[PDB]
Structures are given as C-alpha cells and as structure tokens.
Amino acid sequence: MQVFIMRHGDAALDAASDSVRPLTTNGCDESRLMANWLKGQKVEIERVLVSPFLRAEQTLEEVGDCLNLPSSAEVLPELTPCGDVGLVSAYLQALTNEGVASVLVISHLPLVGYLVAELCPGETPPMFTTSAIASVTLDESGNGTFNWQMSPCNLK
C-alpha cells in the first residue's frame, strides 16, 4: 500500500490558539503546488487521513482542489502534533490488510518524521518542510519502505 505522508502547509503564527491557526496564502499556494505535482505523478488517492487541527484540514482542502480526492476524509485525533505514532502505524496496517491501495496522510511535525521511521526499519526521522511529502510503501506486516521525499522547493 502506498502511503503519502504530508506536513501541513505554511500557517499563520498567531491565532486565538494553536489548533485553530489558519493556513497562509503561501501555505495554500505551495500545498496546491504539491497537489498538482502528485496529480502529474499519476497518483490516485483512495483514502485520506487528516489531523483535527485547522491547518491540516485546510491543507487538505487546498490539495483536494487540485487532485481528485475521496469524497470523505477520516479525521484522526492521533495525527495531531503529539499523536501516538504507534496507533497511526496500526491504523495504516489495518487499511493495508483491508485492501486499501493508497492513503494520503496530512499531519504535523514532529509526528510526520517519527511516522516514517516507525513505519520504515533502518530510517531516522526525516526532515519535513511545509507541504513536503514522503512516500512509503507499506506491506501487510507493517513493514514500510521509504521511497522518496519531495518538497515545494525541489519543485519551485
């Protein structure tokens, strides 16, 4: 199963509180940039998992505007910055055994980095710039391979 791990886009520093910080114009722009790149890669997203935080959901909105995404999305509490990478890993393994062919995961630091390591043996937490995407091929036994990583700058 193809897993695409994405860090939410650039977000405003100030808001009533952290969970509600909106995306910035640039954050939107770059998120659409990465979305179109994926579209050009013949990427077909079957399932979507997103953090409950506004910046994650908005990144999803923006992406969904350029890439054909599922009508629904699953808002996961464990995708927040302090999310339990173990439960995220298990959720992904579940979908893998379910038959799901591909999933797009939109989250935050430091979770995104740890998630890749947790899923892929021998890998250290990679560095994620905003809107950057990590590709991981996960098998039924929870064994994942870190394929590549793409960021708005390596396209820009």
Ligand SMILES: [Ca+2]
């Ligand atoms: Ca469009």
